[PDB]
């Protein structure tokens, strides 16, 4: 139930499939990207967090979070896991291939905050609901996207090979990313997603 | 070795024994307070983190921290665990007893940042070295303290009853404490402990 897929959506890049992993750690793959689309304002990505090992690390953690326990704003239903994710991995970043590396491209990572602005992550239990939170997303855009997510969603088994300690390790790094909240507040304002219509914790 | 005691020291309160636990969670007790002393400028506390379950959650986590991997400033030796602690639990707060609660007083907690200012935590592998980082601490103060720590240090077994997920849960709450770094930068400046003479990450 709470450990059910969580879709995440957002802009990977503004003009102003790929494994989904956590903070680029290639052993922390938590799902895949269901659809991608160059919308007029940027390149929108809708991903699917499907790793049960991950969702369980998260579910157990959310249960000890004060932030998560205060819940959403008003008529929205509490979703402990969807909210732990929203307050932990609040931004997206796309990684492409390089000639330098050991062996839209390499993968998509969930981060504390993205680097390019407007890369706010919006988690949800529904792909339409998620694409629906974005006012840049035209009905049309929502069509090309839905057409795709209808071919990618929830084999090699569980792709998650990190653990509880890995996540706890980078939660400390995030504490030392400067201008995190500020950048995140600029992002939700740029992209138009409010904590009144979604689970945005920033 | 890295999983050896870590002493923490600092002011619990300015004028301008007790179980040591993590963020007041009474199941996350990580050690005890070895000495306490009302120094002229406040009430100084030197604690001892002794829980092997805790030190192991921490050691494994520090190994995935970028902050921890950059190490200390200059001639100081890298201490992954001492640095994960310094960047995670950067402040102290004293909890006294209340008539309200279920059944200097109740306990001392390690927090992201303390509430009262000047409550910066300084971790170390040595009690003298730790008391020694504080320029308010007179040789005298250091005597009353040492006399005590020579009676408290490293039975009911391991007092730690939380887990990896608990810690990961509050690492997210810390991300939403406003003016954390600022308060921490004010604290190390108030108390006189520099990242040039200790492992302060703030």
What whole-number distance in Å separates Cα of residue A183 and Cα of residue B18?
41
Q: What are the tokens at B107?
A: 């306990």
Resolution at which this structure was determined, Å: 2.5
- Give the distance between the most distant pair of CA atoms in chain A: 49
CB A133 within 8 A of CB A122: yes
Which residue in B84, B169, B180 is closest to A172 by CB distance? B84
Domains of chain B by start residue, with CATH? 1-202 (3.20.16.10)
DSSP reduced 3-state for B86: helix
CA neighbor of A88 nearest in space, from A106, A102, A109, A105:
A109
**Token match 């200790």: residue?**
B198
What one-character-per-residue DSSP string does A30-99 give?
EEEEEEEEEETTEEEEEEEE--HHHHHHHHHHHTT-HHHHT--SSSSPP-HHHHHHHHHS-EEEEE---S
Q: How far is residue B126's CA from residue A178's CA, in Å, rounded to a whole number?
A: 31
Q: Are B78 and B2 in contact (CB under 8 A)?
A: no
Query: With an 8 Å Cβ cutoff, are A175 and B180 in contact?
Result: yes
Hey, are the CB atoms on A66 and B181 less than 8 Å from each other?
no
Nearest to A91 by CA among A183, A192, A197: A183
d(C-alpha A137, C-alpha A107), whole Å: 23
Q: Which residues of A touch B170 (CB under 8 A)?
A: 64-66
Residues forming beta bridges with residue A108, ordered by sequence position: A20, A94
Mark yes or no for CB contact A172/B67 under 8 Å.
yes
Which two tokens mark B184? Answer: 């921490």
Interface mutation target, options B28, B87, B90, B172, chain A, most CBs of A under 10 Å: B172
**Whose CA is closest to B159, among B57, B55, B51, B85?**
B51
Which chain B residues contact residue A172 at CB under 8 A? 61, 65, 67-68, 84, 87-88, 171
Q: Do A63 and B165 touch (CB under 8 A)?
A: yes
Under a CB-based contact definition with an 8 Å cutoff, are residues B34 and B19 in contact? no
Given a contact cutoff of 8 angstroms between Cβ atoms, the answer to whether A14 and A116 are in contact is yes
SS3 content of chain B, % helix, strand, coil (to 5): 30, 25, 45
Query: What token pair was written down for B125?
Result: 């592998």
CA distances from B53 to A5, A138, B130, B155 (A): 32, 52, 23, 16
If you search the block for the tokens 């379950």, which residue do you land on? Answer: B53
Integer Cα distance of A59 and A120 in angstroms: 22
d(CA A2, CA B103): 33
For residue A152, give the nearest of A22, A4, A36, A30 by alpha carbon. Answer: A36
Chain A residues closer than 8 Å to B181 by CB: 176, 178
Residue B100 CB neighbour total at 10 angstroms: 5
- Asked whether B188 and B194 are in contact (CB, 8 A), the reply is yes
Q: How would you classify residue B127: left for phi > 0, otherwise alpha for psi between -120 and 50, otherwise beta?
A: alpha
Alpha carbons A57 and A134: distance in angstroms, whole number: 29
Q: In this structure, are strands A6-14 and A42-49 parallel, antiparallel, or unpaired?
A: antiparallel
| A186 token code pair | 């600029």
- CA gap A38, A15 in Å, rounded: 10
Quick check: A68 and B169 CB within 8 A?
Answer: yes
User: How many whole angstroms separate alpha carbon A167 and alpha carbon A89?
Assistant: 11
**Closest to A168 measured CA to CA, from A16, A40, A28, A1:** A28
Three-class secondary structure of residue A189 per DSSP: helix
CA atoms of A29 and A123, how far apart (whole Å): 17
Burial of A47 (0-12, 13-18, 19+ CB in 10 A): buried
From residue B16, alpha-carbon distances to B75, B118, B121, B190 in Å are 32, 9, 17, 9
For this PDB entry, the determination method is: X-ray
Residue found under tokens 């639990």: B89
Of B87, B165, B178, the CB nearest to A57: B165
User: E strands along B78-199, which residues?
Assistant: 91-95, 107-111, 122-124
């Amino acid at each position: 139930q709470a450990v059910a897929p969580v879709y995440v959506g957002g802009f990977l890049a503004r003009y102003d499939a790929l494994p989904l992993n956590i903070n680029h750690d290639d052993t922390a793959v938590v799902g895949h990207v269901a659809a991608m689309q160059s919308v007029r304002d940027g390149l929108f990505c809708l991903g699917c967090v499907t790793s049960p090992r991950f969702l369980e690390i998260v579910r157990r953690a959310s249960e000890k979070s004060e932030l998560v326990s205060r819940g959403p704003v008003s008529p929205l239903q509490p979703d402990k896991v969807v909210e732990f994710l929203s307050g932990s991995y609040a931004g997206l970043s796309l990684s492409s291939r390089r000639c330098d590396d050991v062996e839209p491209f390499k993968h998509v990572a969930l981060c504390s905050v993205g680097r390019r602005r407007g890369t706010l992550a919006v988690y949800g239990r529904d792909p339409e609901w998620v694409t629906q939170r974005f006012p840049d997303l035209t009905a049309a855009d929502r069509d090309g996207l839905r057409a795709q997510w209808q071919r990618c969603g929830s084999a090699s088994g569980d792709p998650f090979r990190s653990d509880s300690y890995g996540l706890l390790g980078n939660s400390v790094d995030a504490l030392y990313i400067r201008e995190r909240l500020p950048k995140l507040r600029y992002d939700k304002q740029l992209v138009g997603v409010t904590e009144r219509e979604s689970y945005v914790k920033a």
